[PDB]
């Protein structure tokens, strides 16, 4: 298909460019490229089509060029929304088969480390009587996504009964993570109490609940 | 513009219809095009229609199990995608181009969850996670637990409390079954003062659980 490197990095006002290289029977063959900008759990935005337009009101940030086999997004005055994965796009010369590229995961660098806001919930009332207890350990908005997570029983590591999401690209750029401590309603109340640490570079937040 | 049908789970050698509305506005009468993305992959187009002609086109990769077909009746496209493989697990869109100002854009539906699995489909259990000690300021919220396949879409008041809300990421449990959670910061004086509502919507299992949260 259309190869693009894997991955970009930039500090703010920077700017760099995106580079998608195809063949002779794609990119190479006409004017039929465009790209593509997705942030996290949302669908793409068309940013460039045929090779340097921009549809209207993107941007002018975003510049396109095309050369030979392969096509150029650029991307100057580098802010820190612009942080997301980019495609791009081709269609052969009949518009009758279109094909993407991998995909370039661009990242703004110096952006501000954020600790882990934490919450733990203990089992309902509702739950336990329903003879379940699940513990819920709600990691909040911080940077970058390097947190990792382990529980306590009283103060010694119940690990494994767990299980732990993977950071997750807030809007606001941080990140956010769930995890869940399963266990029998009775282990729950036969215990002082458990607890969710959460270390995440240099801070280690965390936090204990009790029958 | 565009709006599709919901996520469903098929059999690992089934079908599955996902149906495209063109609900908009316009004079562009361009194809729908269908291009799916595997959850952390890229995206692959999959093929389009061309509504007048009724003229379907569809990458190789997919030729042979997909078969895309517009009902000009109501304006509403079909990708039927078969002989359904593990790998088929991905949201499917549909997208289509536009004039907007002399120059190009393109709609994209909200894509549609389609898991291939050979597990049941299970509606949630909502617990409610009471407020109050460990939360000026309070957290109260929901645990959507045990379902399958996703999503879950968790909203308060109905939709009125539009603020504050927090809806994490469903986490997968070894059983293969889904869990997630939903909170809320909300001002400690409101709490005695105010009904707090979390209206849970698993539409692969046509059930939305309303559950109400408080303290003691
Ligand atoms: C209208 C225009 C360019 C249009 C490009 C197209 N293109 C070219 C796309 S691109 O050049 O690679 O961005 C199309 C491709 C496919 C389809 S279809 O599958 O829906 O039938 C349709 C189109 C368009 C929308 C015809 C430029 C106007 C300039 C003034």
């Known amino acids: 298909a259309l190869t693009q490197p894997a991955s970009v990095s930039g500090s703010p006002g920077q700017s760099i460019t995106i580079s998608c290289t195809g063949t002779?029977?794609?990119?190479?063959?006409?004017?039929?490229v465009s790209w593509y900008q997705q942030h996290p759990g949302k669908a793409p935005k068309l940013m460039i089509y045929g090779g340097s337009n921009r549809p209207s009101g993107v941007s002018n940030r975003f510049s396109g060029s095309k050369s030979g086999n392969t096509a150029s997004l650029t991307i100057s005055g580098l802010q820190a929304e612009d942080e997301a994965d980019y495609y791009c796009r081709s269609w052969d010369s009949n518009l009758s088969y279109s094909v993407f590229g991998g995909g370039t995961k661009l990242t703004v660098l110096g952006q501000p480390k954020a600790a882990p806001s934490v919450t733990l919930f203990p089992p309902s009332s509702e739950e336990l009587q329903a003879n379940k207890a699940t513990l819920v350990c709600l990691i909040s908005d911080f940077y970058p996504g390097a947190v990792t997570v382990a529980w306590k029983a009283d103060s010694s590591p119940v690990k494994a009964g767990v299980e732990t999401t993977t950071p997750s690209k807030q809007s606001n750029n941080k990140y956010a993570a769930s995890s869940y401590l399963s266990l029998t309603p009775e282990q729950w109340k036969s215990h002082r109490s458990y607890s969710c640490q959460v270390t995440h570079e240099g801070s280690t937040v965390e936090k204990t609940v009790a029958p | 513009q565009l709006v599709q049908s919901g996520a469903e789970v098929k059999k690992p050698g089934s079908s599955v219809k996902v149906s495209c509305k063109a609900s908009?506005?316009?004079?562009?009468?361009?194809?729908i095009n269908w291009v799916r993305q595997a959850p952390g992959q890229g995206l692959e187009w999959m093929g389009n229609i061309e509504p007048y002609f009724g003229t379907a086109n569809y990458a190789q990769k997919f030729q042979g199990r997909v078969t895309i077909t517009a009902d000009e009746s109501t304006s509403t496209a079909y990708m039927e995608l078969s002989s359904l493989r593990s790998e088929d697990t991905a949201v499917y869109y549909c997208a289509r181009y536009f004039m907007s100002y002399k120059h190009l854009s393109d709609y994209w539906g909200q894509g549609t969850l389609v898991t291939v699995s050979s597990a049941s489909t299970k509606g949630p259990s909502v617990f409610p996670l009471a407020p109050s000690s460990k939360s000026g300021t309070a957290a109260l919220g929901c645990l959507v637990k045990d379902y399958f396949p996703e999503p879950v879409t968790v909203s308060w008041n109905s939709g009125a409390l539009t603020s504050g809300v927090h809806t994490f990421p469903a986490v997968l449990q070894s059983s293969g079954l889904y869990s997630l959670s939903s909170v809320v910061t909300v001002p400690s004086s409101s709490l005695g003062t105010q009904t707090y509502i979390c209206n849970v919507n698993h539409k692969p299992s046509n059930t939305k659980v309303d559950k109400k949260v408080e303290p003691k």
């Open positions: 908009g506005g316009t004079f562009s009468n361009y194809a």
């Open positions: 002779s029977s794609d990119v190479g063959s006409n004017n039929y």
